[PDB]
Structure 1
Amino acid sequence: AVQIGFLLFPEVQQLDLTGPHDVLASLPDVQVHLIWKEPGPVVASSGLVLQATTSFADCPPLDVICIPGGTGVGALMEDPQALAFIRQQAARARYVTSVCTGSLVLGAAGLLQGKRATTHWAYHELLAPLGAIPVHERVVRDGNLLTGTGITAGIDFALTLAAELFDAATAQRVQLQLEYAPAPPFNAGSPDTAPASVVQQARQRAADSLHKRREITLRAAARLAA
C-alpha cells in the first residue's frame, strides 16, 4: 500500500489538507495518515475540529509527505520535533509536497536550500532567506519536491501524483468520479488579476502576520546557518 501522510497542526488552514486527502483517499491501495505529536483532536484556524491518526514515533515510512499551510505555520517553523520528523521522512519519500505557506515549513527544515519553490503571494519574500530560488508559478517542481499555491493546489497536484504513482487513466477516472471541473465566478485569485483596490485590502490585512513571520524566518535561517 502507498503510504501518504499529512502534517496536521493547530491553526492549520484545513482545506489545504482536506482537499488532497479526499482525492488521494479515493485511490486503490493507498493508506492516508494525519500526523501530529499524538493522535487526537487538532483545531483548524476556522474552528473546525480534525483528528490526528498517528504520532511522529508511530508513523510508517511515507511514500508521500504533504505539509499544509495556515496561521499555525509560524509556530511550526520553530518546532524542533516537527522539523526533525519532516527531515527524517523527506530523506526516503518519493514525493515531498506542500500547499500555500506549508513551503515555509519545508524552508525552516532546510529542505528548500538551492531548490526552486513557491508559496502564498503575500509571504513570497520569505523564500530567499530560507535558501530557496523563488518562483512565481502556481506549481513548482524540483526533483522530488512539489510546492503549490492556492488553498486547492493539493487537489490539482494530487491528480498529478495519481498519474505518476498509478497511470493517467487512473487519475482521469478519479477526476470524473468526483466531477472535478472548477469554474470560479471571479478572476481575483492572483495579485496580477485582482483589482488594485482588492490587492491593497488583502496586503493591509496580511501586514501584521508578515511582520511576525519576518522575525520567525530570520531565527529559522540562523539555525540553518549553524
Structure 2
Amino acid sequence: MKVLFLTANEFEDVELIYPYHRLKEEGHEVYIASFERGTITGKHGYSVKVDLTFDKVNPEEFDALVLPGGRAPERVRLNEKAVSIARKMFSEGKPVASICHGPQILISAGVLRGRKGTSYPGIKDDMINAGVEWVDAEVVVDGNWVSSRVPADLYAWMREFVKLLK
C-alpha cells in the first residue's frame, strides 16, 4: 500500500523514522510530503528527504496516512492543502495513524467530532474541545484512526496500525 506522511521541519524524529521503517518492513511504499522539495530536519537533528510537496499530493493516489508529532503539525495545520489531504483521507475511512501533536492536523480538518482517541497529553483539552472522547492510553483504535501519545508508545502504535493496512 502507498502510505503518505504529512510533516515538516521540527518533526519529532523517532515518530517519523519509526513508522517509516516499520511500514517499509511490510513492503509498503512510504512517501514523505512537506511544504517544499529537498530535506527537512527533526527537532533532534535527523534529516529526511522530502518525496513530494503538499501541492503535488492527490489523496486519491494514497491508501493510508501517518501524522508524526513534534512542532511540525502546528505549521502543517495552517496549510490549506495539507489539511485538505488529511480531511479527505480521514473522512473516506482510510487508515490514519497519529501520535503526539500529530492530531492537531485532524483538529484543523474538522473530522474528529465524536471520535475516540489520544494525543500528547499537553493538547488533550484541545482534542476535547474538537469533540474527541480523549483517552489516556498508549494506543487507541477507533475504526480507521489509530492514535498514540508519545515516543514510549511507538511499539503499540504501529502494532495496531500495521493490522489496519493488511
| TM exceeding 0.5 | yes
Question: Is the strand fraction higher in 1 or 2?
Answer: 2
What's the CA shift string for 1:84-118, capped at 9, x where partnerless? 12112324453111011101221121121111121
The residue type equivalent to 1:140 in the other structure is: V
The aligned counterpart of 1:14 is 13
Q: TM-score, normalised by structure 2?
A: 0.86
18, 22, 33: which is aligned to 1:35? Answer: 33
Identical residues among aligned pairs (%): 22
Gaps of 5+ in 1: 167-226
Matched, 1:88 2:88: yes
Pairwise CA distance, 1:42: 1.1
Amino acid at match of 2:48: L
**SS state of the match for residue 14, structure 2?**
helix
1:66–1:164: structure 2 CA closer, same or farther, 3 Å change rule? closer
- Gaps of at least 5 residues in structure 2 are none
How many Å separate the matches in 2 of 1:163 and 1:72? Answer: 27
Q: Flag the structure with more relative contact order, 1 or 2, with Cα contacts below 8 A and sequence separation at least 6.
A: 2
Q: Is the Cα contact below 8 Å between 1:17 and 1:154 reproduced in 2? A: no
Larger radius of gyration: 1
CA contact (8 A) 1:101 1:119 kept: yes
Counterpart pick for 1:53 among 20, 32, 51: 51
TM-score of the superposition, structure 1-length normalised?
A: 0.65
Distance 1:40 1:93, change over 3 A: farther
In structure 2, the CA distance between the partners of 1:143 and 1:33, relative to structure 1 (3 Å rule), is same
Please name the residue that 2:141 is paired with: 141
Aligned residues: 164
CA–CA distance in structure 1, aligned partners of residues 90 and 16 of structure 2:
18
CA contact (8 A) 1:98 1:148 kept: yes
- 1:43-192 matched pairs, under 5 angstroms: 43-56=41-54, 57-58=56-57, 61-92=61-92, 94-166=94-166
Change (3 A) 1:62 1:91: farther
Are the equivalent residues in 2 in contact too, given 1:20–1:158 (CA < 8 A)?
yes
RMSD: 2.0
